[PDB]
Amino acid sequence: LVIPEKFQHILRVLNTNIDGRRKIAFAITAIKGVGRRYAHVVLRKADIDLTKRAGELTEDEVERVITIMQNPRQYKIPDWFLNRQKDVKDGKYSQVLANGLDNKLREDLERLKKIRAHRGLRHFWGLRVRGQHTKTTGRRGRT
Amino acid sequence: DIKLFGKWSTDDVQINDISLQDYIAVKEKYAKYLPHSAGRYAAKRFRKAQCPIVERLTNSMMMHGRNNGKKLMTVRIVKHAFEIIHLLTGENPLQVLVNAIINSGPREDSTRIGRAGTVRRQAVDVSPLRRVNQAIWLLCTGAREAAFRNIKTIAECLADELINAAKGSSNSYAIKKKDELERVAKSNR
Amino acid sequence: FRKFTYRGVDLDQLLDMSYEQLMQLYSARQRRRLNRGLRRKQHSLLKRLRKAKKEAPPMEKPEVVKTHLRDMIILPEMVGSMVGVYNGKTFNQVEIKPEMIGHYLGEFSITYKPVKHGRPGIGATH
Amino acid sequence: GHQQLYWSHPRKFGQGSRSCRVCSNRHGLIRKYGLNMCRQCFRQYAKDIGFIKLD
Amino acid sequence: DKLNNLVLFDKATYDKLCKEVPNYKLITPAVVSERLKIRGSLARAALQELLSKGLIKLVSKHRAQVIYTRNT
Amino acid sequence: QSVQVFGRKKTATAVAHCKRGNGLIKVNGRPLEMIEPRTLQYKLLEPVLLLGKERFAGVDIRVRVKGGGHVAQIYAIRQSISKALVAYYQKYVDEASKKEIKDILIQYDRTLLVADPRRCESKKFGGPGARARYQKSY
RNA sequence: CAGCCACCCGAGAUUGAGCAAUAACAGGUCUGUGAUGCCCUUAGAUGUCCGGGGCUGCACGGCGCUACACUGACUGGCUCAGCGUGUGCCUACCCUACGCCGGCAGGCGCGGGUAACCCGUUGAACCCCAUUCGUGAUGGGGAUCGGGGAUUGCAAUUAUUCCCCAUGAACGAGGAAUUCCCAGUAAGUGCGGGUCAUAAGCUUGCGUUGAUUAAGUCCCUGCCCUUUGUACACACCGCCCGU
Numbered sequence A: 001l002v003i004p005e006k007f008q009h010i011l012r013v014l015n016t017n018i019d020g021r022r023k024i025a026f027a028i029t030a031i032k033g034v035g036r037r038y039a040h041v042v043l044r045k046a047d048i049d050l051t052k053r054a055g056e057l058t059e060d061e062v063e064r065v066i067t068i069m070q071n072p073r074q075y076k077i078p079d080w081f082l083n084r085q086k087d088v089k090d091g092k093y094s095q096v097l098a099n100g101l102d103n104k105l106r107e108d109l110e111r112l113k114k115i116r117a118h119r120g121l122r123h124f125w126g127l128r129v130r131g132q133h134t135k136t137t138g139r140r141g142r143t
Numbered sequence B: 001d002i003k004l005f006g007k008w009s010t011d012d013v014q015i016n017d018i019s020l021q022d023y024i025a026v027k028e029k030y031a032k033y034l035p036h037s038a039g040r041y042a043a044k045r046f047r048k049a050q051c052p053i054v055e056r057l058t059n060s061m062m063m064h065g066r067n068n069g070k071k072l073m074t075v076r077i078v079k080h081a082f083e084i085i086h087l088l089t090g091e092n093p094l095q096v097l098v099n100a101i102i103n104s105g106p107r108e109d110s111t112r113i114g115r116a117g118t119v120r121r122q123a124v125d126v127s128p129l130r131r132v133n134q135a136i137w138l139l140c141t142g143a144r145e146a147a148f149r150n151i152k153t154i155a156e157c158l159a160d161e162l163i164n165a166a167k168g169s170s171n172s173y174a175i176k177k178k179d180e181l182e183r184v185a186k187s188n189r
Numbered sequence C: 001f002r003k004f005t006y007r008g009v010d011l012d013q014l015l016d017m018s019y020e021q022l023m024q025l026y027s028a029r030q031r032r033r034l035n036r037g038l039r040r041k042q043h044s045l046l047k048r049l050r051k052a053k054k055e056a057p058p059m060e061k062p063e064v065v066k067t068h069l070r071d072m073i074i075l076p077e078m079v080g081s082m083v084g085v086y087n088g089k090t091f092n093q094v095e096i097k098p099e100m101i102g103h104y105l106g107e108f109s110i111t112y113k114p115v116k117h118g119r120p121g122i123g124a125t126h
Numbered sequence D: 001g002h003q004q005l006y007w008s009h010p011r012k013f014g015q016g017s018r019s020c021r022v023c024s025n026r027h028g029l030i031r032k033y034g035l036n037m038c039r040q041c042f043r044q045y046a047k048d049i050g051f052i053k054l055d
Numbered sequence E: 001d002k003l004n005n006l007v008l009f010d011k012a013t014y015d016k017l018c019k020e021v022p023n024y025k026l027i028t029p030a031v032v033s034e035r036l037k038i039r040g041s042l043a044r045a046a047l048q049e050l051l052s053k054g055l056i057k058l059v060s061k062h063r064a065q066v067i068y069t070r071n072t
Numbered sequence F: 001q002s003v004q005v006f007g008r009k010k011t012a013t014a015v016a017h018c019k020r021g022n023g024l025i026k027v028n029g030r031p032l033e034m035i036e037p038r039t040l041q042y043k044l045l046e047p048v049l050l051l052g053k054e055r056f057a058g059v060d061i062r063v064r065v066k067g068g069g070h071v072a073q074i075y076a077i078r079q080s081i082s083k084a085l086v087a088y089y090q091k092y093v094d095e096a097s098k099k100e101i102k103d104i105l106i107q108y109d110r111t112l113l114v115a116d117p118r119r120c121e122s123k124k125f126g127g128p129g130a131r132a133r134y135q136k137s138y
Numbered sequence G: 001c002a003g004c005c006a007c008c009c010g011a012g013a014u015u016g017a018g019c020a021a022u023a024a025c026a027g028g029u030c031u032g033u034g035a036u037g038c039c040c041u042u043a044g045a046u047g048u049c050c051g052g053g054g055c056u057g058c059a060c061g062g063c064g065c066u067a068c069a070c071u072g073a074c075u076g077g078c079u080c081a082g083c084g085u086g087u088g089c090c091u092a093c094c095c096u097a098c099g100c101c102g103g104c105a106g107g108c109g110c111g112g113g114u115a116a117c118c119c120g121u122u123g124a125a126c127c128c129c130a131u132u133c134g135u136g137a138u139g140g141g142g143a144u145c146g147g148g149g150a151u152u153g154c155a156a157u158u159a160u161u162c163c164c165c166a167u168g169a170a171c172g173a174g175g176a177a178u179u180c181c182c183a184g185u186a187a188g189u190g191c192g193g194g195u196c197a198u199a200a201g202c203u204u205g206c207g208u209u210g211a212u213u214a215a216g217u218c219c220c221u222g223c224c225c226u227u228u229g230u231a232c233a234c235a236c237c238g239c240c241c242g243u
Helices: A036-045 A059-070 A107-114 A118-122 B053-059 B071-089 B093-102 B128-146 B157-167 B173-188 C012-016 C043-055 D039-049 E029-034 E040-051 F041-049 F076-091 F095-108
Strands: F016-020 F059-063
Touching: A036 A059, A107 A118, B053 B071, B053 B093, B053 B128, B071 B093, B071 B157, B071 F041, B093 B128, B093 B157, B128 B157, B128 B173, E029 E040, F016 F076, F041 F076, F059 F076, F076 F095
Parallel strands: none
Antiparallel strands: F016 F059
């Protein structure tokens, strides 16, 4: 329950963005390595208590699921929630860390720009790579 | 006899107006243990004009066509109107429904003028059958106006719907539209 | 700088071992036309490959060769030869980097382009 | 040309592999139930074959 | 603004659940608990949990316009 | 034992197998008291138990109505209850008891037992549905 | 009287379609036709060969799509409510259960089915709704290209590729004007069939859905009848007058 001190409103855990107003399946999803079915499988394989709440969370719990995100090969599950899966720069599913160095961090997008990949050109805009018949098309990519 | 458990009774309804004997059918054999038993009033030669108040509440609330799909929901909301108004008032829900809709609602409701009218309305002596039925309609649409699309916690929205429909708070939009209708009715006077 | 790695999977390490076990790990797509067998209906592609790699080594635009085949891929030695569409109306000449193994967008040559768009104004309703 | 260039690939299945069994027309054919007619020939012969307008 | 909310059960969610809410003629905790400006849904959840101590099985939640107990 | 009254609402597939015992109705393995919808329970349990619990101990009925939809097997169970009781008290008690139990089961339900032939209606060409067409002409 | 409006021994008191007259159109079809009048003459003839490709050079004021929300949730709930196809006679090209490759497109294998007999008790909503809603940018997108690996068919380049993944262009039904709609209709969703070597956001049918209705009118757009006027009859998109 709440105690007469600071609630876990705004803190820097893993440089992610989350505010304590939306409930479960949304708070865990705020970190790009936790949420939905992957959260289900992690909570299963780690044998975790259902009652635990994220309202006053501990950093270790999110970190451990993130470590599982880095290395899900042993678990025999899709290493999903990664934009870097089977992509250049990782010999094996590796975790890149830190922010403010996005160009270096996501150099995958720089590799896609230097090869001028239309697929890569898709990222940065909201549109279909296939491009459907002339109609409400093109509107995909509004800034 | 037939009653509600060992704690509630349903034989406490006597208005004695001698005017609800031509449209509200209680005369001879229209009694039901059942709140609703799959009526076929459509196939009948307009034999649906002797309809009681509970079925009006049953059939006059849904917005658009976004509730139909299972009359399960209709009968369930009849049952839960029963129980929720019973919880609100501590007595027979239908009795207090009538009590709290008669003391308010349409005194002279919306009805046109002569052969064609849309500019203003006419302060019309509302017939007891149509006054009661349209007051239940007011409560139903106010329930789907207040309980639905509410900015507050919904377990007292029937209490505030009763407040808006009878006491006259400036919360429900239907009650201010009816206020404009009453302003026209007084324009007639 | 950075060389070519096969989509996060090592390539020089791939060539470290033998060659008979690479077909068991052959990449996705661009093998169907010759999937009927490493037999007839294939000699033309290898003939053009020898043609181009004799007139132009890798990392170079080839000499008058216009093959329309996807050039079933095993290694980024495909550079040094160009997939081109020949009609008298289609002529693409682009030097493409050797990062193409069984994967996306190794072909910049395009057989169509938008046609002259006229004036969109001059009224819209009457 | 007569038998040397053609007939070197499966192409026995296209729309040209069918034609109306009454007029040898390849447009608007009816494959359902196998009577294999066009629209208009079937409309002409429906009474005789056994199809009657009731719906 | 960024209104301050508490994600889980709270003392305010536990507040006055049996002190003056069930001692009124209208036994409905919704609006009265809402006056505390603390989430009323979890207040209802706490009230239901304390009502379902284990003597009578109350696991059904039903719709929003749902009944509450009589304890006056 | 043959009474030949059944219970059939809408198109639900029902069986009314009669042999002496307690009157129980099995729905998805859930008996009459504990019912599948779990929300229309009072509306079906009110007529029988308030008059007596041994009231159904006359002739047991296998009622296994494989009904899908709550309006389907709900009110089908009460149709079965009323029909079985009325037929048993008709054929195997006497005419006067017939009259009185028919009176109470008719004040239960005046006239809504049997309906007209109707269901979801057909679709016509020229439009997406039964009575609807393509783009509008204002 | 013909009939109409409501109901007191009482299952039933306007289901929806098919057919659909006389007289007409210079309405459409000679690119459905072994249903046919009036024709052409001489070289990569409209019929074989066209890797590539024809509307796709396109910004939801032509069918089928977003509910700013307890009427809504992911099986603690289904003994279910429910059109009609499916293989070799020309002709190889059908529907598929079940195991393995598998935690999966797709591939392999024996098996059933000429069909109420096999697909199949067709996965046509999950009603308590065991990740679980307070002032709702954030379950009402996730303004879609990365990933076990990507097709029984030469060609998948605006296209049958395929099983699925954090709020981010909309914000409360978005009006210049429009070959929609009244009792299981509108509108969600999906499932079939025709097209189909590959394929349906097309069309044609099929499913859980209502009434206290508006038991209305001729103000629009039209139609019908009567009277009436006409200088109209190519019939008001007429006739016609004058500079």
